[PDB]
Amino acid sequence: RLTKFTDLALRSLMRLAVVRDGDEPLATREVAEVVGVPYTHAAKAITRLQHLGVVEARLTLTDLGRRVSVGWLVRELEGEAEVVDAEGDNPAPLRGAARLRRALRDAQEAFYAALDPLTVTDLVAAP
Amino acid sequence: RLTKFTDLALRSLMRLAVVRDGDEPLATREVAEVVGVPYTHAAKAITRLQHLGVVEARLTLTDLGRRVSVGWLVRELEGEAEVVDAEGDNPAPLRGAARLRRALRDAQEAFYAALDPLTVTDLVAAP
């Protein structure tokens, strides 16, 4: 599974990918409603997506916002979760623990490897 | 990342892999201490590992307990977590949501694909 935040940001920019013509006014209120979350979590996602340069804030996607690999975007959004959340793991000494930790980091990289090929435009497509 | 339970069971049978000679008496009390968790969670892991046939309970590993693929074992331990935990996800309608859900299930399968090659004996090894 993923991160609740990583999820949130993905859904958010995925929704901002949707409208491309003069469809409507969309800001943090509109998208906080749309993806179905409080405004407090959606400001966090919108801003961390502005700091990663996908959202230009006057809200729309940037060209960066559309051509970016999702596996990398997930790495960047979920890596901070790997920092904050995994600091309170503190597991005990077990024989072979680090050899597993190696394997788990690898399988995670395969998870990310399957998501590196695709963009947000691939997510919200229409053949 | 993984499941707290999946983790727990892995560490448990990994510890039961350790002693193979007449080293000591090991039961659910000993291993609940060893991997550093309450007895209440460790009985759940020990039993779900007996129902998956890796632990013979008179506690040791079975031959099944040693030659099993970990990617499959994780699939089986974390799949029930995919049932219980993901029932309370209930996400809202988003354009392209199911195409993502496809991708996320795939990347997960790549995560598991990297863990399918290895056993518990590979985890607790010694070249």
Residue numbers in the entry:
A (entry chain A), B (entry chain A): 2 to 59, 66 to 134
Pull text from the paper:
The most widespread dedicated NO sensor regulator in bacteria is NsrR, a member of the Rrf2 superfamily of homodimeric transcriptional regulators. NsrR proteins from Bacillus subtilis (Bs) and Streptomyces coelicolor (Sc) have been shown to bind a [4Fe–4S] cluster, which functions as the NO sensing module. In ScNsrR, reaction with NO was shown to result in loss of the iron–sulfur (Fe–S) cluster and formation of iron-nitrosyl species. This process led to loss of high affinity DNA-binding and activation of genes that were previously repressed by [4Fe–4S] (holo-)ScNsrR, including those encoding Hmp-type NO detoxifying enzymes.
